[model samples]
Target chain A: MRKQEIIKTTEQLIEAVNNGDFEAYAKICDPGLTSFEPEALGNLVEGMDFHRFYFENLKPIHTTILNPHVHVIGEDAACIAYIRLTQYIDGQGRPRTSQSEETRVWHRRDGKWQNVHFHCSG
Target chain B: MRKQEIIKTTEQLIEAVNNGDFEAYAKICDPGLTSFEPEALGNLVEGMDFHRFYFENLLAKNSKPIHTTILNPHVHVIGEDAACIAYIRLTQYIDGQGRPRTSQSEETRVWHRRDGKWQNVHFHCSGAPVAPLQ
Candidate 1:
């Protein structure tokens, strides 16, 4: 049941990102969210400002999660790893497809799941 | 402190790799270690055997210590047994042209305490350009 809850929350977070909804994204993520993604270029980034910029300028992109592996650590913390495939139209109006490996850490507080940390490969 | 111990263990893990000591590296890792490392090409690899190849063939010949710098290391201790460490790693080495070069990667390592010892259970590393090893 807990694993299902986590997977559902993960889907919700991805939905927010796919819709480019900053408000929903922020609600699902911790204020002090930390990440190591391709955009950061080998840097560890913290907080929501970095993500806010993407939600503002980037268009909605379709994401598909494949081979998700959830590792529950204790009651409040869990880690999920998966392959993320993205399909979007580039500025040139051409379809583009790309994939990356992702590992996300989630923490439950106040009966809700909050994404706390994540790492992404380009 | 637990944070300090985690950092210390992380350093030891790095040292083990830099020194090309597979035994030390193996000791710091769990038998069922999982990772999405650059070498795996976007695939999540499980078990120690996936890494043993590099240790045996690629790293065993390097007796000299490879220069490495861990930058902005952050240790998040989750509960009593689970901890995560994320940082940027800069590695310096000589290229085939005999010129010095630097490669950087962003890494996150998950450690779980088992039997009073912290063992790395999972990790994700990236930032390689084109090739698996940068």
Candidate 2:
């Protein structure tokens, strides 16, 4: 039951941002989310608004997490590691493909799970 | 208490490896460790046996972390049994060419509490940014 919750909630967050739905994309984030993205410049990206900017730069076309290995932490936390294939609307107005290993952190609260951190490595 | 244990234990593992003690490095790893390191050829190295093998391979070289800066390490505790440590790591070391090398990375390691102890279970390493969740 917990593992399923981990995946289902995780997928929703991915798909929301992947399709470029800023409204839906904006909902799944925890207020304290910290993002470590490979392409982003700097040490670490802190806070939700900053995340929106980084994500908006890409306008993600599609994203899929393959064969995720989920680690159950406690009753309220879990993390998943998987290979991600993503497409972006590039500067040339064309599709840009990237392959990366992604690790996402999630926590359960008020009967829901929200993402707190996502780190992507190529 | 949760945050402190997470930091101290994680640092112990790092120090052990940096100090080049294979015995100390091997003792702390979870048997099921799956490591996703940025510098690997394929990028995902798994299992304690692989870790031991990898560390063994390192024995031939003096390639060790001479200086390290761990920035903004956030320890998120999952009840009393588990925790996640996320940090921005800047490490400086000499390369195989016998020159200086500095690498920047974002690291996340997960620890599981079992048998009344904290053992590192899984690590997700990626290659960082200034963003936060919405």
Candidate 3:
């Protein structure tokens, strides 16, 4: 994909996540998608696992993306973004909010962009 | 340079950083080198500033390279590594020490493999903060 297309796709992805539209999120992903969340609760996702991971983890939070910078490296692209989130815990828990920085590496496959690697923490 | 050579050069660079060999580090870097230290206290260095940045900052710390993985793109390379090292927080007359100011990055570097060796032509690094999540 061209650089503009890549950036557009990235912005759309972040928007979909913010809107809680996991279906749209899944459509743009590659089948061989791989994600690396260093501070995640479990293993990185592969293939269709990307959708499941997002739904289970981010569904309950309200997230805002700030200062997103994208770099194109051949067929792969990297994005570093700052994010703030307000999350509501389960009925028995208290609400919380926080900010973090994240880096994601995406690869173009089958003419669509899919996340190949991701690392996020606080 | 080929992928293997790029990886090898990255390993050597990390080794040099681990051993506090700033001279060798300077030799491998391009004269127009640019560094992005999002978490750093000051501006990113370029040219001879690379040497000065290292000497003033990393020189006092004892660091080690843990898991250094390298990925080579056509014009640049990205490395994802886990490092365990200690750095001085400050010298406020009381032997200052702190671990809260440390984090790693998914470092992307542009390079030129010349004469059977690899050298960094450009570098960009970004990562999460070391602070604990709430």
Candidate 4:
């Protein structure tokens, strides 16, 4: 993938996730895709349907990707790394911030880039 | 580049990081390598020098690899020389506080097949929040 093309595709995906719409994520993933989103209450979330299922359920606090560094994966694949900043309201409804790292893998499927894998750390 | 070969090279790189050996990683990395590590440190932690500081100073001594999971990657062939791979990895290690921790990272790596060898040009890693052992 061209560098700018790769960056644009990645930015789109991040936009989708930041906005809490993984439909953008699903569209870019391939058939029979594999995922690894695990925590204590976590189950393996696979394919598009499961991804929707997991996120709808996770309801994880609002989050953002900052300072993302993109790396081209293959002809149609790329890797994106960034600081994952999560915002949560306390019991008093006060906003607080937590930080971690995250990485997502996107690859071309059927001529368009869709995500293949994604992970975030606390 | 062959998919298996790419996987093998990645496996080697992971092993080097796990074992805290910079030389092994140096063999595969480009001279002007660019990279990103997790965490919002005070200093600029991009490019090769930062990578050097970690491998030589922090990795093996401060962070000890307990186990590693290198999953399959989505491989794409770019022209006849280069390849891109997107994958995930789970690494369990002992942190400086002597706590058991596990991190899942999403990675993209670029490799150039040159002179009969695969050399790493760039690598980006974004890791998930770690889970501490109970």
Specify the highest-TM-score model's number.
Answer: 1
Interface RMSD (Å) of candidate 4: 5.8
Q: How far is each candidate from the true structure, as Cα RMSD in Å?
A: 2.7, 5.5, 8.9, 6.2
Off by over 4 Å in 4: A1-4, A18-22, A36-50, A56-64, A73-75, A86-91, B14-21, B32-44, B54-116, B121-134
* Candidate 2 residue lDDT tens string, A1-122: 67777778778887776666767766777777777775566456665777677567764477777777788876887887778887778988887888888778787767777777777766
Error of 3 at B11 (Å): 2.0
Clashes of 2: 10
DockQ of each: 0.67, 0.45, 0.07, 0.12
- Model 2 ranges with Cα > 4 A deviation: A54-60, A87-96, B41-43, B60-65, B95-101, B127-134
Docking class of 1: medium
Higher-scoring candidate on DockQ, 2 or 4: 2
Instruction: Give the alpha carbon lDDT tens digit for every residue of A32-104 in model 3.
Output: 5444344433234453664576576753666665545454443444433334344646566777766554544
lDDT of 3 by residue, B73-92 (tens): 22223333110111111111
TM-score of the first chain in candidate 3 relative to the native first chain = 0.59
Model 2, C-alpha of B105: deviation from truth (Å): 2.5
Backbone clash pairs for candidate 1 read: none
Write the residue-wise lDDT of candidate 1 on B1-134 in tens digits: 88888888888988876665789988999877888987888899884788766656554334433477788888776777888888888877766566877888788888888788889878888875212133
Give the lDDT of residue B106 in candidate 4: 69
Colliding residue pairs in candidate 3: none
